RNA sequence: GUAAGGUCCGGUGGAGCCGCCGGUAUCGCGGAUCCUGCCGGGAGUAGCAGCGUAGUCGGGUGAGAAUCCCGACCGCCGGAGGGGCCAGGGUUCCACGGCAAUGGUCGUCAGCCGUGGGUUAGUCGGUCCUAACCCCGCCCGUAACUCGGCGCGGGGGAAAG
RNA sequence: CUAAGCCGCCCGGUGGAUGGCUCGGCUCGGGGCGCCGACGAAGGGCGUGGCAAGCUGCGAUAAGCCCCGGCGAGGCGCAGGCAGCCGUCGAACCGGGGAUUCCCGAAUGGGACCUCCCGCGGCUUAUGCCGCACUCCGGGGUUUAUCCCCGGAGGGGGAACGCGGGGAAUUGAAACAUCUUAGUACCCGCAGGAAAAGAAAGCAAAAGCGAUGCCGUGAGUAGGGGCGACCGAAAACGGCAGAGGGCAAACUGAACCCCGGGCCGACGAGGUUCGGGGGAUGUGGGGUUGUAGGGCCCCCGUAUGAGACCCUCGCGGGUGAAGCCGAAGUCCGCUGGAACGCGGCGCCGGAGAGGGUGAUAGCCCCGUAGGCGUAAGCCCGCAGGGUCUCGGGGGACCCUGAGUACCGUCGGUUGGAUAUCCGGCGGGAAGCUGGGAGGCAUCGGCUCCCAACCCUAAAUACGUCCCGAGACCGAUAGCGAACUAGUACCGUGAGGGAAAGCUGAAAAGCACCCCGGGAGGGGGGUGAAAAGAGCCUGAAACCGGGCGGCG
């Protein structure tokens, strides 16, 4: 980019700047960081190192801390979630939740449990953002809601996939981002008996 | 018949030539030779050709003046073609 | 029909450069409740003879026959949805088919009947 | 110039035909968007490539 | 003209029709250059495409006859 | 607000935009006789002389005439500023309709613009012959070739011979 | 009541910044597809539209012609006009297959100062077709002329990648010559969708491994170096992917191969036969290896059985072009030019990805979540018909690659250092009772191997191209080109190479009146708003008028 132009410098003597210029009329400047149409001085490069590494043990400790914080009261409320109707924190549910594969049934179950308000809040908070992301396909900046954690999936992901801002994650593939979106811990989470047993087995 | 003739020339100079010198003016295809133009005219119009002159205009098209024999009238062929 | 890319550039490029046989399916409008109950089809492409009722625009609620259909612009002209020129002539307003409802179907076409059978 | 090969004459004829204005009906059809084309030429000022 | 009706006729009739269409096309081009009352500006296009159809079907008949004979 | 700046009020505009936290970057403009675009004083100024100092009077056209057209008179080149015709130019050729722009001023005029037309060969030239010279095949050299080359066979080579 | 002039505010002109927008760029893990040409390629010239200049597409059948299939009422490119025409006998459009396909161009019957011309033979009544370049291969004829006839090859192109050769300097060493730059830029030759390599005369020694290629690491280490600047590996180990075969000779001796025809078979596989061309200077059978392997000879047994592969007269299945189905509000009130907005009332959701629609829309439309179909081609299988392959012990006989391995010297190259590899010159063996390697040479021991012949998929390199994505750019940025862009233009030439996006929801693009030669001006209309085409916003510089201050 900016390196396809053939230029010859005028040199000393002429009442101009010693700048490389084209050999054809109208003899514009070219191939300079400060010349219109020229190369950029220090542009982005594909060889840059953007991947960051974290030790496995440190990542495990962070996941432990996130899971511990997910059951707190002050932090979950302070994050933004509305937990007025939640029976208790952490919210543990029987294994029956894992066999539901219909969004209406999941909606009714969540209404009874006391998180439908949080789902509605997430839907309201989701909206069109500001900037050039609309050009590139990031028109909406969606919000987060309750996180469904199960020990084994047999339809629950399909059932609860479509609710605004809820992720259904099998306990085995549970990561720190699932529990602390945007680096902010205290995400409202609903677990399962099997998931809690697996958490006990793994110790985190 | 044939692909020699593209279109009659309907210009005032052409009409004057038809009226005076028993000549028909055609725009024909470039690769055609004088024998080809003569044969095409004779076969299509059932007339006898006395002479053929050819030129290439500044537009790249070949124009032919075909002078018919006194036994046949060029005005009749012009009327048949609708030249008027 | 599959438009799988979730990128606005590709979506709009497909919309603008779609062939005519694909633009054909882009000029569908919803049916009325009675027609929906009768034919078990939610919507159909709109022909010229079809009766139409308008929902959105300065001519909302107006009913009339579809006068013109333009696949290139994805537009239609409906009787009565007109504008007054300065000289005093009547012209047709171009209306997107998505802002129209088909309250009566002109179904003399066996291929259209086949489409209805397939979709029902 | 007086004596010209046929191929060169044909090329000159093509350039001559190329040189002409944009049709007014084309301007109307494009809605005053298409007015001129790059191949316009003035014989005394803009010379042929050959 | 339609390909079916063209296929109906024989090769000799196809050649005769081609000759007539060529002559008429020349006549209409001359008339277009002469006058301005172009009642049917599409006659030239129709004649040209009919010529193309006639030639194509003549070639098809020739090829199929040769294949059948061989 | 010491500040880099932020925020409010009043107009225009018609479709997106921001506070806080945590990350990322082609992240902050007066210079580089910096780059691109636009616009100033010089200036209604220089130039429109020098080598051939050229127009005037009536009439016409046209909204408009020093500059276009006709007549007369006065002039200039007159071994070319006249006549014929290459290379080069490529439609500048002809008629009609025009003056937004071009023409060192004006313009009804034009090598300008728009619309139509114009180049007719047995005898004129190319085409034929060969000159200086060039190319191809075989052959030899080269790591190799689209490179260098003697000798044979073939072909080209003059629009003023 | 001060003339010019200065600063500040308002309005107007000039200009095109800013803001918002984007059918274009750039980058990328993974996925797909990768050669075209004498059956005449790619690049180019010229033509082709009713009105047609540029671009795009097509070729005298010239923005097109025909057939099968998909879609289902409009269509006639970028490109909003007049006129007309095509389509329900299914158009336009899309996927497949055909027809036409001017001239030059490897360009090829011979020539090019002009992409146009001139030739020679058979057929044809004639129109008009078929043959004729050079350098070769396999045949025939004769004239023995490379002269004629039949069949078949090479030629040119391709963005990057690949293979084989030739091969610099600026620059660094703070100068510079060994060195570095560098086996790099560039040049010549040669292939493909990949190429090259590839199966041990190898790697290593307490043990041992077992073709090649690629990655991590070994490692800035062994080692090279005016031992200066600097240059610089392999083995082992962990991974991806895995695959191994054929000749020459010993022996046999026409049991053989190709072209054309016939017959049996199914039209195929296979079998058989005739003519021609090759072949005893060896076609075919066998045989491919290291304390050995193989031929031949001898002895025991085996084959009865068990494989493997070839073909599809036939059948079944999978995959496979266009493509088809796919839920939910256009329900009341308000602002509004127009609801996608605000408040209320609802529904679907395996679908709350994304886009359009007169504002910001899960339920208006496309689509997504999830499913279906498909000619040809490809893949698998059934069934029938064929071909082909298969054991051990002993020997004293035979075979196992020559100007080759290797030695000396010279040049290049290498980390290769007295111990890398290639080449030239001069010498040059053994050859099975044999030979080679183990980092200076030679001797002995030990270990590991059998060169001087050939082939080999997958793991890999690239992206002209195609799906998909983005903490990349947002019209002086991003590719040079968001657009009639390698276009216009500059240079004899090699070659160099721009600027240029935005009316409005709908043209509703100002009907009529006065003035003017005209351009246009003033009224009056359209529009929510002139946003008036010199069209989204309209900054600054600069200029004109009014206003306030000085003068």
UniProtKB/Swiss-Prot annotation, chain A:
Q: Does the keyword Ubl conjugation apply?
A: no
MF GO annotations? rRNA binding; structural constituent of ribosome
Any Gene Ontology biological process: translation
Q: Which UniProt keywords apply?
A: Ribonucleoprotein, Ribosomal protein, RNA-binding, rRNA-binding
- At the top level of its lineage, which domain of life is listed? Archaea
Task of the protein: One of the primary rRNA binding proteins, this protein initially binds near the 5'-end of the 23S rRNA. It is important during the early stages of 50S assembly. It makes multiple contacts with different domains of the 23S rRNA in the assembled 50S subunit and ribosome.
The protein's name in its UniProt record: Large ribosomal subunit protein uL4
Q: What is the species of this protein?
A: Pyrococcus furiosus (strain ATCC 43587 / DSM 3638 / JCM 8422 / Vc1)
Gene that codes for this? Answer: rpl4
Residues of the whole record sequence present = 52 to 255 of 255
Swiss-Prot record, chain C:
Q: Does the keyword RNA-binding apply?
A: yes
One molecular function GO term is: rRNA binding
Per its UniProt record, what CDD domains does this chain match? KOW_RPL26
Recorded hits in PROSITE patterns, A to Z, give: RIBOSOMAL_L24
Which segments does the entry list as coiled coil?
Answer: none
GO biological process, alphabetically ordered: translation
Keyword presence, Ribonucleoprotein = yes
**Keywords annotated in UniProt:** Ribonucleoprotein, Ribosomal protein, RNA-binding, rRNA-binding
The entry's cellular-component GO terms read: large ribosomal subunit
Source domain of life: Archaea
Q: Which SUPFAM superfamilies match?
A: Translation proteins SH3-like domain
Q: How does it assemble?
A: Part of the 50S ribosomal subunit.
Q: By its UniProt entry, which NCBIfam families does this protein fall under?
A: rplX_A_E (TIGR01080)
Family designation: Belongs to the universal ribosomal protein uL24 family.
Q: What does this protein do?
A: One of two assembly initiator proteins, it binds directly to the 5'-end of the 23S rRNA, where it nucleates assembly of the 50S subunit. Located at the polypeptide exit tunnel on the outside of the subunit.
Q: What is this protein called?
A: Large ribosomal subunit protein uL24
Which species is this UniProt entry from? Pyrococcus furiosus (strain ATCC 43587 / DSM 3638 / JCM 8422 / Vc1)
Curated annotation (Swiss-Prot), chain D:
Which key words are in the record?
A: Ribonucleoprotein, Ribosomal protein
Which InterPro entries does this one have? Ribosomal_eL39, Ribosomal_eL39_CS, Ribosomal_eL39_dom_sf
Q: Which residues form a coiled coil?
A: none
Recorded GO molecular functions are: structural constituent of ribosome
PROSITE patterns registered for this protein in UniProt: RIBOSOMAL_L39E
Record's superkingdom?
A: Archaea
Record GO biological process = translation
Disulfide pairings? none
Mention any one GO cellular component term assigned to this protein in its UniProt record. ribonucleoprotein complex
Sequence similarity: Belongs to the eukaryotic ribosomal protein eL39 family.
- Known partners and oligomeric status: Part of the 50S ribosomal subunit.
User: Which protein are we looking at?
Assistant: Large ribosomal subunit protein eL39
Query: What species is this protein from?
Result: Pyrococcus furiosus (strain ATCC 43587 / DSM 3638 / JCM 8422 / Vc1)
Could you tell me the gene encoding this protein? rpl39e
Curated annotation (Swiss-Prot), chain E:
Keyword set includes Ribonucleoprotein: yes
Question: For this chain's UniProt record, which GO biological process terms are given?
Answer: translation
**Family affiliation:** Belongs to the universal ribosomal protein uL29 family.
Q: Where is the signal peptide?
A: none
Q: Which HAMAP family match?
A: Ribosomal_uL29
Keyword terms of this UniProt record: Ribonucleoprotein, Ribosomal protein
Q: Can the keyword Ribonucleoprotein be found in this entry's annotation?
A: yes
What's a GO cellular component annotated to this UniProt protein? ribonucleoprotein complex
What is the name attached to this protein's record?
Large ribosomal subunit protein uL29
Its ancestry begins with: Archaea, Methanobacteriati, Methanobacteriota, Thermococci, Thermococcales
């Amino acid at each position: 980019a900016g390196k396809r132009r053939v230029t010859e410098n005028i040199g000393k003597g002429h009442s101009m700047a010693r700048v490389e210029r084209l050999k054809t009329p109208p003899r514009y400047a070219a191939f300079v960081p400060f010349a219109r149409g020229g190369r950029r001085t220090h542009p982005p490069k594909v060889e840059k190192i953007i991947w960051e590494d974290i030790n496995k043990k440190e990542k495990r400790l962070a996941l432990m801390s996130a899971i511990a914080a997910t059951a707190n009261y002050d932090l979950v409320r302070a994050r933004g979630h509305i937990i007025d109707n939640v029976p208790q924190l952490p919210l543990i549910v029987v294994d029956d939740l894992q066999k539901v594969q219909k969004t209406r049934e999941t909606r009714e179950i969540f209404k009874k449990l006391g998180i439908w308000d949080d789902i509605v809040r997430a839907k309201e908070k989701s909206g069109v953002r500001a900037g050039k992301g609309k050009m590139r396909g990031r028109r909406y900046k969606k919000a987060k809601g309750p996180l469904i954690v199960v020990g084994k999936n047999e339809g629950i992901v399909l059932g609860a996939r479509n609710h605004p801002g809820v992720d259904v994650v099998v306990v085995d593939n549970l990561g720190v981002e699932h529990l602390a979106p945007g680096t902010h811990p205290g995400r409202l989470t609903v677990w399962t008996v099997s998931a809690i047993e697996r958490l006990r087995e793994l110790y985190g | 018949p044939y692909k020699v003739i593209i279109r009659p020339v309907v210009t005032e100079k052409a009409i004057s030539l038809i009226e005076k010198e028993n000549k028909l003016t055609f725009i024909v295809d470039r690769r055609a030779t004088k024998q080809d133009i003569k044969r095409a005219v004779e076969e299509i119009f059932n007339v006898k050709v006395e002479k053929v002159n050819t030129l290439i205009t500044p537009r790249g098209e070949k124009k032919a003046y075909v002078k018919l024999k006194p036994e046949y009238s060029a005005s009749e062929v012009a009327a048949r073609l609708g030249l008027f | 029909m599959k438009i799988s890319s979730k990128q606005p550039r590709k979506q709009r490029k497909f919309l603008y450069n779609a062939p005519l046989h694909v633009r054909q399916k882009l000029m569908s409008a919803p049916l009325s409740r009675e027609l929906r109950e009768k034919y078990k089809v939610r919507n159909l492409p709109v022909r010229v003879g079809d009766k139409v009722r308008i929902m959105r625009g300065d001519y909302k609620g107006h009913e009339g026959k579809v006068v013109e259909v333009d696949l290139k612009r994805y537009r239609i002209y409906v009787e009565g949805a007109t504008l007054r020129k300065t000289n005093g002539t009547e012209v047709f307003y171009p209306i997107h088919p998505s802002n129209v409802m088909i309250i009566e179907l002109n179904l003399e076409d066996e291929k259209r009947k086949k489409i209805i059978e397939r979709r029902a | 110039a007086r004596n010209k090969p046929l191929a060169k004459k044909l090329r000159l004829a093509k350039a001559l035909k190329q040189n002409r204005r944009v049709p007014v009906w084309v301007i109307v059809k494009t809605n005053r968007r298409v007015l001129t084309h790059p191949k316009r030429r003035y014989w005394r000022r803009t010379k042929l490539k050959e | 003209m339609k390909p079916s009706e063209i296929r109906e006729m024989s090769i000799e009739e196809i050649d005769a029709k081609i000759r007539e269409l060529r002559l008429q096309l020349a006549k209409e081009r001359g008339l277009l250059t002469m006058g301005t009352s172009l009642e049917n500006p599409m006659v030239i296009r129709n004649l040209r495409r009919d010529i193309a159809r006639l030639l194509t079907i003549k070639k098809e008949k020739l090829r199929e006859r040769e294949k059948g004979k061989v």
